């Protein structure tokens, strides 16, 4: 069978508008390991996104962390979008600075 990915989008440090930070997209619980992860600022793909090397957990599911440098503002919107064979359509999850 195939496993459906779970996604968390969150900053490395507590966000302060105008202070440089790192935005993470942590993807877990997926199988097979081929996966396509992009991060989006105000609806547009962010070019410079780094990816950890892939690993898997005791339950055979893979996980990976994507991240990008960013400087949060009051109004900018961020999201992480994952395409994986376990899903008919890509899954988008938005950054909520309260989470």
């Amino acid at each position: 069978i195939q496993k459906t990915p779970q996604i968390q989008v969150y900053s490395r440090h507590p966000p302060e508008n105008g202070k440089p930070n790192i935005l993470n997209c942590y993807v877990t619980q997926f199988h097979p390991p081929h996966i396509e992860i992009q991060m989006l600022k105000n609806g547009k793909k962010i070019p410079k996104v780094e990816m950890s090397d892939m690993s898997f957990s005791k339950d055979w599911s893979f996980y990976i962390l994507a991240h990008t440098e960013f400087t949060p503002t009051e109004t900018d919107t961020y999201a992480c979008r994952v395409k994986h064979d376990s899903m008919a359509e890509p899954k988008t999850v938005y950054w909520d600075r309260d989470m």
Binding site: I1, R12, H13, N24, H34, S55, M99
Partner: protein, 277 residues
């Protein structure tokens, strides 16, 4: 305390698009210390924790050649499994292995692992007795008989009680200082609006290591079982972890709630509340 040396192995076929992708990833006490990735022109075992840079050139050469031997053997196994399962040559498939040893503080083997999965489901595993196998399906029964014939379980036991324990001892010597690392969580509570006369209290724990932790919310010093929300513990990206747990409470009653944070890095558990600035 106890310690473990575990290797996580991945072999992924990709018909038409190349040779299979093979990976060996080693963990000492649940932290990555070495990695072989075949997806290169000249794939080499590499240190993944700076304290492994101690090992000399012969170590890397020897582990590299053994990795490449493993890779080629798994290339064969992928074909073998297409056969057992009567699957077409066209699809991508995965073989995964968890192999390793857990030792007690006395340096004796506590548990040994040799677990296999095909396409993300259990295939075969060495039992706790280190003598017998558990096969998950009719295909694994073939392998099981094969390995019963060749005395594979005995070979694995020799590895688990010998080689594996011995290397773990050596890696501990080279990396114990940094292996014993703890970082205590830094905690704080945030306050968030809900509809009508309710509010959300969110208790954050940040910058901790290892990842294991517990957050709880208490009302008047009594634990809340239902209705606590939380996220799975998650990497900050700098080698530390984050987590939060929240509860919904009545507006005006925030001061009746406390968050408690339990972590091995702490001198004692943290107790905190919403602090209206």
């Amino acid at each position: 305390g106890p310690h473990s040396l575990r290797y996580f192995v991945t072999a992924v076929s990709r018909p038409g698009l190349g040779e299979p992708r093979y990976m060996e990833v080693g963990y000492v006490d649940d932290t990555e210390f070495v990695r072989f990735d075949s997806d290169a022109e000249n794939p080499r075992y590499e240190p993944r924790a700076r304290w492994m840079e101690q090992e000399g050139p012969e170590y890397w050469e020897r582990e590299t050649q053994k990795a490449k031997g493993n890779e080629q053997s798994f290339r064969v196994d992928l074909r073998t499994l297409l056969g057992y399962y009567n699957q077409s040559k066209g699809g991508s498939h995965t073989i995964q292995v968890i192999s390793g040893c857990e030792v007690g503080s006395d340096g004796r083997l506590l548990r040994g692992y040799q677990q296999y999965a095909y396409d993300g489901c259990d295939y075969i595993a060495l039992n706790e007795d280190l003598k017998t196998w558990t096969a998950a399906d009719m295909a694994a029964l073939i392998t099981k008989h094969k390995w019963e014939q060749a005395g594979e379980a005995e070979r694995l036991r020799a590895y688990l009680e010998g080689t594996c324990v011995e290397w773990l001892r050596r890696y501990l010597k080279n990396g114990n200082a940094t292996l014993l690392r703890t970082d205590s969580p830094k905690a704080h509570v945030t306050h968030h609006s809900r509809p009508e006369d309710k509010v959300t209290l969110r208790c954050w724990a940040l910058g901790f290591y290892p990842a294991d932790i517990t957050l709880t919310w208490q009302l008047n010093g009594e634990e809340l079982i239902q209705d606590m929300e939380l996220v799975e513990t998650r990497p900050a990206g700098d080698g530390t972890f984050q987590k939060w747990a929240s509860v919904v409470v009545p507006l005006g009653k925030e001061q009746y709630y406390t968050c408690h944070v339990y972590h091995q890095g702490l001198p004692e558990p943290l107790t905190l509340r919403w602090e209206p600035p």
